[PDB]
Amino acid sequence: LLKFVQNEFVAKKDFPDFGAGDTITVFYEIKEGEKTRTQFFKGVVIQRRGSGTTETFTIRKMSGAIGVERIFPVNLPALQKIEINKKGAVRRARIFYFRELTGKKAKIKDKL
Amino acid sequence: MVQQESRLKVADNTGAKEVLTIRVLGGTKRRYASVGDKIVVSIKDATPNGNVKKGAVSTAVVVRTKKEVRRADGSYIRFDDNACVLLNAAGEMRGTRVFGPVARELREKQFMKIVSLAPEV
Amino acid sequence: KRLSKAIKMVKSPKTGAYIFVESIMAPELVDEFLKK
Amino acid sequence: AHPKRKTSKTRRDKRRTHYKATVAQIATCPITGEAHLYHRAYWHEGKMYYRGQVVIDKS
Amino acid sequence: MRHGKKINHLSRQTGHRKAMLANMACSLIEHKRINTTVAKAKALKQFVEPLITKSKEDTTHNRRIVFAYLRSKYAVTDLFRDVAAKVGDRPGGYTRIIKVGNRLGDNADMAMIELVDFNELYNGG
Amino acid sequence: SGLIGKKIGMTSIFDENGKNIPCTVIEAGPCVVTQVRTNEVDGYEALQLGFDDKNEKHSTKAALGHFKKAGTVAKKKVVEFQDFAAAQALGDLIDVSIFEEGEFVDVQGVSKGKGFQGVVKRHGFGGVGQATHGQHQRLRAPGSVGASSYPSRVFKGMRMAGRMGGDNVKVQNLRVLKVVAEKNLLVVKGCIPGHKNSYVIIQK
RNA sequence: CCCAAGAGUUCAUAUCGACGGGGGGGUUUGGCACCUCGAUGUCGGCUCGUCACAUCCUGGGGCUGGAGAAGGUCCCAAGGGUUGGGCUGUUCGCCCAUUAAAGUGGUACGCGAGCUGGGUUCAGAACGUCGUGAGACAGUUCGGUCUCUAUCUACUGCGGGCGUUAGAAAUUUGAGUGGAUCUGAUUCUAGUACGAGAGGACCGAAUUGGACUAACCUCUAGUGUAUCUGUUGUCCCGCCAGGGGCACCGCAGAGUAGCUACGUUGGGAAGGGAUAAGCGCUGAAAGCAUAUAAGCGCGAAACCCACCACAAGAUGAGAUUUCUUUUAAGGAUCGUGGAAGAUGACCACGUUGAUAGGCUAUAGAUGUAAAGGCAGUAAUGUCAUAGUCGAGUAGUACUAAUAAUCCG
RNA sequence: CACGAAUGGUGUAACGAUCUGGACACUGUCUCAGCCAUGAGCUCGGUGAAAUUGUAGUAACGGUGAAGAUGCCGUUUACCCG
RNA sequence: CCGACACAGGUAGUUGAGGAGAGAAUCCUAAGGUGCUCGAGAUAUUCAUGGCUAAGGAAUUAGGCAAAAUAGACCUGUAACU
RNA sequence: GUCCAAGUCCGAGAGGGAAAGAACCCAGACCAUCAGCUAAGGUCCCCAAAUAUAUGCUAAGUUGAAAGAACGAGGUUUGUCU
């Protein structure tokens, strides 16, 4: 059964609950010339797309003046200790307008 | 995905701002060039002081693409602009600085000179 | 490492002469291709 | 395009062999004896019988 | 290719189709049995089953939800007053479809789409 | 050296050393040997395998009598395999155990039918010209179908529009990943022709 | 192709070869005027291909003024491949950047009942020149209607009838036919052999790409006139609240199933036989010599197998297992549907039934419904991760799949 | 070769559904096509033409021939009807 | 009425409303008049009229042909040349 | 191909042969006949008649229809001189 394969051949993670609008930091395990080191990516979660064991989430940051977006599958054997700084306060499921939008005013709305 | 007649932004202190793609090297009828692929370009801006002239023909590598590119581990990278870095007559970069981040796929192709002086990789 | 070409002769039944059958194999696997 | 030769009464008769009609699937109900189409209802006398029972009684 | 399109356009626009499906439901509610074609009846069944299902609980929200579909207070009140009281606690399938032959103008297969709880003479088997 | 399965779905797992791998689940249930064709009465060595049992209502008397000479009863899918590995007689069962972890298989399946398709979607022809530079009604036309008076005929094999449909296709050495035997799983890597819940022939 | 004065440091034939001669092909310009003027539509380009080898690349060799690598020339070989732009209506041609290569030609200078009309030969106007003039130019420029519902045959697909020697339900052998045959870069062998140095391999073994093609929708991406939400104008539901109609689906933000590529996976792998150019063994005719006359060993992407698909209407109509031996086995009509499909056909089910819908739950889409309370002067926010949908999945006969008939 | 001064010569602001060359924005014009809606088309019920037509049970190759063959010669292929 | 037709053509003048609007434009409606004298299934190929397309942005073509893009009111500002 | 001269044939001409050819070879059709002899050309089968006889050549499927070169060669049979 497909449901029997999914929850048995993919190691589930223990990451907190986040969605669109949240600001997170993801620590992955970048490999190199026979030495692996952790690297952090801090950005706003744009969308979370998927059903289970194959779902991904997209996170966007601004490395100076150039925007960088990255898509991570949640059940990656390299993701470690996702941290959450801000939280939500949006009105959409996929905040796609946040990609074609920059400046000081369109950063994020705070959640009360 | 950059092909012929595509305008790119040159990301280094060589003395150019905008460039135009002429050819995608690497075989017959090659369609596109993602990050790490070599292309032939023609300078079109040529900043006043500069080290290159407007109208010259050179070779470059695609550093940042706007098209989401997939890795082996299942992740994706997607920048916000199509950028390139010029190359010497041989397999070497001309210049000493690189503006903005680069892609990690530029490391598996022995572009250590380009990857060892960028802000982020 | 390095391979080893083993050329062994045999009495072909299609004619009756001595043909030649070579094959690239391991330097330590030529003993099992010459006994057959 | 235009036909080059007049279609003979043999070539036009060998073609009208699948142009035949199709006899309907007629059934009979062992209640009132009236014939009807299979899997269809029918009006016998101010009523509508379907499967031995009565659906409408407009008598 | 329509490998999964479970909806019949009935040779009508997206507005005309919904208008006709909302106009046939009011008729099927005010008269407990109407005579249509086969495809239109099969579409009206799938359009009217969830409405009668929602009608089994008289709330101010469900009334407005059913009104957004029927677009006629005369059918809303007649669906919530006696149709819901006569349906009772049926698991499902509040309507039946019976073919009654063919038409004459265009030779279309007809049907007699009816409510199950309002016909006391027919059972089926 | 051969089995029958049913395509369940498709998902993606991660290898033990990083990279993601797409995979397809094949509920390769226990097949039963129905008839062993020898080289003395037929003329070649092979054996039939039946996969999914039927009822006593849909089955034929001929099929009932044919499967009564065996163990389990009339099957939904019966297919004849050849060149097995272990000599086995009638009534034997092969569940999943014929495959290993890391081997290659040659899954064969019936594709899904597209119906009557034009030349552009069937063979890959491209247009007749542009879309606005005088183009009148040949945006998806085949073009020409031959030359002038020589040969004055359309050559046999001309690629034209017809029912694309779904035929039998082999997938040419998909790699096996999981061979779980308790629940018949046979998780292989790659795609498989056909819709879900479709029968497939897994040749080892 | 024949002869060879020479040129090639000396040496005619590594390479070129004058003065002369003998032929093959019918792709150029011609000669003839043999079928068509009660019409054989003419250049260029697009789509679609197919054929020859007089071979551009890949494949196998001989010679060399071949140390190696790069070359020159000749022989065998048609399986696959043979790029994108600037100028010009262009064919052609020049140029720019790549590639292993950017082949030569035929098919009415292939293809206009397949497309365009940019050029050329229609009517308007102007320039240069000729003619007194009307007018003309292998001189130039701007504009200028491309008709037809496929009868026969030829192709691509799908069915009905009958026959295979009694009839059915399945699984198959194969007489044959069709499809795919591409190739780069890097590493080790090895800076080894060779070479004074520079430079730099044969053979063999791995890694990873480009183009093409088939399948699939797990990921990315597009659509998604099922679905959800926000908002504008006006009309309607008696009024407020809340909704509905129309305005390109009114517009805007998403989107499951499905269909696709821009995505994922796989393939062109390996192994035989007879060979072409060519390389040898033994050996005479012809006491020697000689790969050949007898007999043997190698030898290419060419051919026959091999890989994939179809295939007994293969009338030469095959074989096996089981059932029934004439209203028997069984098939069909009709109905519920499809992952099947133009219509036939195909597949599952038809009450001793889970085939479709409904219902109960849920994967999931959208994003916090309506009514009411609280805060403010109000617009609004909160209690309130809720409402609506659920093209998918599972369980339940509530609804529809008859209690007919036909062939055998 | 072979402009030329009222069959006017040289310029010219504004104007032109005029002709020609170039730049920005923009886009399916294209790389390279993909998805969706209605009408036509497809099946069924009703009415119902026309152009065209010597008779036809109307194959392929090589060749001959008024010099480019469905009908001629030799070989090959092809169950009947849509 | 004039066009052979119960024909997507032509036919002088007068009245010709509301909301937003300068407007008789434009969208929805008044009074009033119509649903256009063949329909039903199904949701192939293909054509006609439309909608949306990731990256590139004329690389297409004889030619930016066709589509897309700017479009309202109020302010700031506005070159060579003449 | 074209323009003359000496003949024949087609034109205006059937029949037989070269596989099919207006002219090439034989041969000038008053009818009817299930009679015989011959011309060109042939006698293994398609397709009438020799798998007939005597002598020699060819090893190339040359050839069995028509039609080929300059220039090579230690293929073979045969005559003379030497």
Curated annotation (Swiss-Prot), chain B:
PROSITE patterns membership: RIBOSOMAL_L14
Gene3D superfamilies cross-referenced by the UniProt entry: Ribosomal protein L14
GO process annotations (BP): translation
Keywords (A to Z) from UniProt: Ribonucleoprotein, Ribosomal protein, RNA-binding, rRNA-binding
InterPro entries: Ribosomal_uL14 (IPR000218), Ribosomal_uL14_bac-type (IPR005745), Ribosomal_uL14_CS (IPR019972), Ribosomal_uL14_sf (IPR036853)
UniProt xrefs under Pfam families: Ribosomal_L14 (PF00238)
GO cellular component: cytosolic large ribosomal subunit
Function: Binds to 23S rRNA. Forms part of two intersubunit bridges in the 70S ribosome.
PANTHER family referenced in this protein's UniProt entry, alphabetically: 50S/60S RIBOSOMAL PROTEIN L14/L23, LARGE RIBOSOMAL SUBUNIT PROTEIN UL14M
Assembly and interaction partners: Part of the 50S ribosomal subunit. Forms a cluster with proteins L3 and L19. In the 70S ribosome, L14 and L19 interact and together make contacts with the 16S rRNA in bridges B5 and B8.
Family according to the record: Belongs to the universal ribosomal protein uL14 family.
Protein name: Large ribosomal subunit protein uL14
Biological source species: Flavobacterium johnsoniae (strain ATCC 17061 / DSM 2064 / JCM 8514 / BCRC 14874 / CCUG 350202 / NBRC 14942 / NCIMB 11054 / UW101)
